[PDB]
């Protein structure tokens, strides 16, 4: 056995288990943004959107998503919420949204 | 210079897609008479404009589907069935030369 090696797999484990916690937070959180987006609670969805959008960026400073890949998940959400609120009621906050 | 190709459409029968037949001439590697060999390029025509038998240019482009790597540049002439018949004559003839058979 070669203790230079083993080191980096114990390493792995620990980041996987911080990278799991990171993503599997964002799914959850942003799914509960899509959700509040449906039935027009423009107040609350636009709250959840920004506490999504940041937990994005801080997984972008890191090594979970790339700037390229995190920017992606920002447009997935941001646009798709600006649009579920089409089929309902106008943006109260206008938090993570530019009129 | 994302390559530019002049060929004549020979397939309408698809969605926003179209098949084009581009041909080229050249001395035979060794034997060296001019020969002329051609190939068909599944082009992209979005708004659908160009029809079955048109004379077009194509350019290398951002891949659109599996076998779509060319958008259509412009039209050099319309109505040129002469070859579309010829290309179909070739496509037909495969009915013959089979070891199923060919009837009278």
């Amino acid at each position: 056995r070669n203790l230079s090696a083993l080191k980096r797999h114990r390493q792995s484990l620990k980041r996987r288990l911080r990278n799991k916690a990171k993503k599997s937070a964002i799914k959850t959180l942003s799914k509960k943004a899509i959700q509040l987006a449906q039935e027009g609670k423009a107040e609350e969805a636009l709250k959840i959107m920004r506490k999504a959008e940041s937990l994005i960026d801080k997984a972008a400073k890191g090594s979970t998503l790339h700037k390229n890949a995190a920017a992606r998940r920002k447009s997935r959400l941001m646009r798709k919420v600006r649009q579920l609120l089409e089929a309902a009621g106008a943006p109260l906050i206008g938090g993570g949204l530019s009129a | 210079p994302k390559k530019v190709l002049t060929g004549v459409v020979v397939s309408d029968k698809m969605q926003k897609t179209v098949t084009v037949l581009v041909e080229r001439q050249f001395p035979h590697p060794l034997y060296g008479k001019v020969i002329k060999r051609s190939k068909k390029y599944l082009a992209h025509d979005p708004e659908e404009k160009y029809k079955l038998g048109d004379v077009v240019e194509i350019i290398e482009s951002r891949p659109i589907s599996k076998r779509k790597r060319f958008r259509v540049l412009r039209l050099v002439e319309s109505g040129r069935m002469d070859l579309v018949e010829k290309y179909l004559i070739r496509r037909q003839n495969y009915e013959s030369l089979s070891k199923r058979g060919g009837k009278a």
């Binding site: - | 035979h28 034997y31 008479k33 020969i35």
Partner: protein
């Protein structure tokens, strides 16, 4: 033809068939002997030339000429086998190298030697 005929059809590069099979690529191949016999020759000739059918290490079971006067070949003597056929006897197309493995070098050989696996006899 015409140019075009060829352009369409073309010139079919000739194919080469090795007048020596058994040696899967090899120049020699060791086998054990099976039959040790002598077969009388072809047509203008007359002798009792000496031969041995030899199982191989390429799978085969080919027959072999014994070059020379004397020999030591019995049914289980290991051998060695090189190219070079025989215009006197048919079905024999490789020889047996004298002197390697349970195969003799010929004694009483001064001249042609290096072929016959016989060394130098000075103090002669």
């Amino acid at each position: 033809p015409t140019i075009n005929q060829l352009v369409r059809k073309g010139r079919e590069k000739v194919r080469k068939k090795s007048k020596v099979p058994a040696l899967k690529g090899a120049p020699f191949r060791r086998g054990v002997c099976t039959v040790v016999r002598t077969v009388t020759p072809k047509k203008p000739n007359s002798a009792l030339r000496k031969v041995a059918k030899v199982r191989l290490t390429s799978g085969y079971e080919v027959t072999a000429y014994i070059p020379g006067e004397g020999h030591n070949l019995q049914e289980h003597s290991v051998v060695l086998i090189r190219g070079g056929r025989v215009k006197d006897l048919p079905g024999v197309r490789y020889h047996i190298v004298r002197g390697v493995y349970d195969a003799a070098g010929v004694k009483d050989r001064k001249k042609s030697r290096s072929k016959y696996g016989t060394k130098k006899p000075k103090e002669a």
